[model samples]
Target: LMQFTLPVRLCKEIELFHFDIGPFENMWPGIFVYMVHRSCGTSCFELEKLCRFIMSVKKNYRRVPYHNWKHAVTVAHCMYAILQNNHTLFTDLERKGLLIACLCHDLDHRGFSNSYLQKFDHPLAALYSTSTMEQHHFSQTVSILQLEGHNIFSTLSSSEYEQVLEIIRKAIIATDLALYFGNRKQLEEMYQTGSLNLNNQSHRDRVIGLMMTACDLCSVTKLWPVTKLTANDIYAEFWAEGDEMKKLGIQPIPMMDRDKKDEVPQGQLGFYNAVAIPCYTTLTQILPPTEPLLKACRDNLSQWEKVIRGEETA
Candidate 1:
């Protein structure tokens, strides 16, 4: 039972799509509260308990460079934007599930990837073997929900219970970009075919999973300021891992080396060409409302190309 004193202005911004990418902590509880109220209808009637639940989970997020609450809330903000813009396109339950999944997907991240865990023989690696972090995030989500006085879904009807938690469980693991990349073309066609009726539960589940990746990697699609900040945070974490490996007599990959920070703009351009472009292009085509996301990503890609050639500074 953690005590939280939230700012009134924080609640103010959480309700809007004003494009405020909060590196701020107070933003999350308000966003979570609003998402539950919007997407759960009357199912989550215990509002105060839900807010406390969010606070409890928020505080548990470790102060890692890229995986901290700042990144969590930024991803959550993107999820809120997606839901707000496409409310007409998704059921409230599906939207609520996406919102919760985005907020909790990186919960308890160890600032280590599956490879890093396996390379060092980390215990989480022994436990998971694959999706080492994502599975743990799902487990942490359940643990946090089970916290005393923090059962936010306690007010749900029995079916609502299965409905929400099932989606949450799946969406958290789907945040693994590795999984998303594998399913991208299949899912792009799923959108293209419009083959599944909106009521088809698995279809809805797949869409929620796709949207989780969209928001998780949303750094590429955001306005430049936030995107650059996210890039530096990402490299900072990469360098930390590489630095640790150096101490253990292991040579880090060229990409992970902090000495390569000067090369990041070039790598950023390569990442956009290799991953971001095709995915967002397909997404914007299928969902016209996300065109702005594609546009912003392309804008940054062009800027990074300039940065790599010394025409611009990253």
Candidate 2:
């Protein structure tokens, strides 16, 4: 059964600046198609199958306040921007796989953290002992691909398909902050010590993981107005999960607590310091072309600080 809220239009042009326009959900699929065509070519991907796959992927996403279809599109756009500007940095397969991974990274997300799932003994927790939600997303990605008329990578050679699928798996799983945390210090140190060689597959995998983290958090790398709007949706989802925790007789953490809403500015600042800023900083180190991402994050970091200090009204 096919269901679509907006018809897919093959966009004639798409620039990086176009990625930040808010409330343009209707145009997202078109932008996605345009990115794919530009990144690869029209020769391999059948237009009908591609459109069907895109629609299916979009349909699979739940209408959660965050981790929804819009989030997926924006993350894919971020990956497109990165790959487009630095096309020579990775192979054609890597670029294609990364974009697909970004688009499907949070597929079927239920607006709850991995911790929440495990804490409640959620069935997904039983399915995967670690990275529960991410594993499920990857599983859903494969399921969609197996659907009739949804395998966009049909033209890939057998080995190419296998490698790209592995790329998709690694990239999707890397979106988990817990996994990113484990890889972050090592990635940073590798870059700092001048030991990060793109020639090595192991080094490249870590870099790919970092790229996924940066794109997944790309909202922080956008303009203040855009970032602010996305932040509201994120916390809306968090608070929903928080309310669930309260009903379960479990006290939510400060950031997730609806009663602690006023402290959101501080929480934003802490997140940027601990996650966003550092992630972008290391990303800028490895891929200097992504420097603007780091700069934009710093701008948002200052804004969050001002919001906390009452120097600026958010």
Candidate 3:
């Protein structure tokens, strides 16, 4: 286990920017903050503890991009938004635990893609290899939460324990990109049929699962300032990974090396439009009031396209 510590100032900043902690819940920011606080509690002590645990990992050590604290917080915020907007779709306990799971899912993530872990047969994979990345994340989260000095969930009752465990397990597993296309397709089919069978266990599970996964996938849907910051972090990580691959005498993944690859001629914009936007657009239609966010994603994609084309630069 990595020994991580979150600076108090950083923890406060994260809460101020990423969480809403007061009343007047109808506003977007308030709703988002309230949901996060509700699921994980509003105590600064608890939040700081969780943040410290997440910051413990040397994310840059791995060539993996998009696995750092910022990304974790981003996904957690996205999950919070989804829950606030769709609370009726889940049981109260499930919703809370799912949000907590989202917040902690990638604690100490090494910034490597699941493929890298599988290829290296990382000790984590071997120790809990059945579900690969999800298992690793879940195991690590549980282990960290059990650390003699920092058992965050120790105060919960037995029933609460089981529910939290299940929610965390499901949310972590849902991060698989392998499930992305299929999940999107299922959402499309469900939308076309004008019916979502929330009563069916499998159907309900898939909806909730896809909701979290989509939040992770379409994160660029947020306001430009936030999205730009996140996009740059992702690009930086990808570049780092690509350099590592070159040093290892392995070919880098496409888009990982903007200089070597023209796969997305318009840069990340092309990738976002062709891949991310469509996926998110479909999601917006299936779930209402998401058009604004999806549109923001579209705008960002266009801006990136301009940057790639040298019409503008960030």
Predicted structure with the largest lDDT when compared to the true one? 2
* C-alpha root-mean-square deviation, candidate 2: 3.8
Clashing pairs in 3: 4-56, 6-52, 20-33, 64-111
- Order of all candidates by lDDT, from best down to worst? 2, 1, 3
Question: What lDDT score is found at residue 150 in candidate 2?
Answer: 85
TM-score head-to-head 1 vs 2, winner:
2
lDDT of 1 at 227: 81
Report, for every candidate in turn, its global Cα lDDT versus the true structure: 0.75, 0.86, 0.61
What digit string (tens of lDDT, one per residue) describes model 1 on residues 242-264?
A: 88788777888867899888878
Task: Report the lDDT tens digits of candidate 2 across residue range 140-166.
Answer: 999999998788899899999999999
Candidate ranking (TM-score, best to worst)? 2, 1, 3
lDDT of 3 by residue, 157-265 (tens): 8988787787778778877767666777787788789776777767766766776666676556765566666666677667766776666667778756747544443
Please identify model 3 stretches exceeding 4 Å from their true place.
1-35, 38-66, 128-131, 148-160, 261-265
Query: Would you estimate the TM-scores of all the predictions?
Result: 0.88, 0.93, 0.74
The whole-model C-alpha lDDT of candidate 1 against the native structure comes to: 0.75
